[PDB]
């Protein structure tokens, strides 16, 4: 039911590039920011700003006039382990800005480094919502 994704370059799934997840209606997605110990001098530390882009933004790694700002991995030294961000794959959202999800469609996510990549290659995640026939 719940899907856990650790957002870091050290992860073997992200290194492939073709990292995709098959999700159903009313399912959850948990994104974990890269957590580092106090001994780290914050130089090797990774910090990313997440964006929800389209198919054009997925291949070109651009978020300007193509996507919207989602979450930010600003402080790596969080008290209760890594920073957790929740995303529900609901059909209808009660919140005014809250993102809706449709069955049998693809949704894309990208991340840009704060210090940087230089528009060469970005850490990307492909999200596909399975139709009503596939989900029970």
Which residues here bind other proteins, judged by CB under 8 A? 69-72, 74, 78-80, 83-88, 90, 92-99
Question: What's the closest the beta carbon of residue 60 comes to other proteins, in angstroms?
Answer: 23
Please report which helix (H) or strand (E) contains residue 109, including its range: strand 105-113
Nearer to other proteins, 62 or 72 (CB): 72
- What CA–CA distance (Å, rounded) separates 136 from 125? 25
Question: What's the closest the beta carbon of residue 97 comes to other proteins, in angstroms?
Answer: 6
Nearer to other proteins, 59 or 74 (CB): 74
Distances (CA, A) of 40 to 29, 45, 76, 112, 113: 28, 8, 10, 22, 18
Strand-pair partners of 107: 127
Question: What's the closest the beta carbon of residue 103 comes to other proteins, in angstroms?
Answer: 15
């Amino acid at each position: 039911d719940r899907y856990a994704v650790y957002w870091n370059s050290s992860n073997p799934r992200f290194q492939r590039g073709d990292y995709h997840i098959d999700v159903c209606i009313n399912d959850y997605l948990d994104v974990f920011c890269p957590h580092y110990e106090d001994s780290v001098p914050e130089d090797k530390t990774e910090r990313y700003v997440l964006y929800m882009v389209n198919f054009d933004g997925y291949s070109a790694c651009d978020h300007t006039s193509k996507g919207f700002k989602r979450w930010e991995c600003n402080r790596p030294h969080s008290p209760n382990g890594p920073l957790k961000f929740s995303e529900k794959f609901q059909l209808f959202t009660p919140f005014s800005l809250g993102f809706e999800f449709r069955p049998g469609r693809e949704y894309f996510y990208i991340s840009s480094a704060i210090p940087d990549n230089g528009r060469r290659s970005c850490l990307k995640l492909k999200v596909f919502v399975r139709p009503t026939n596939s989900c029970m």
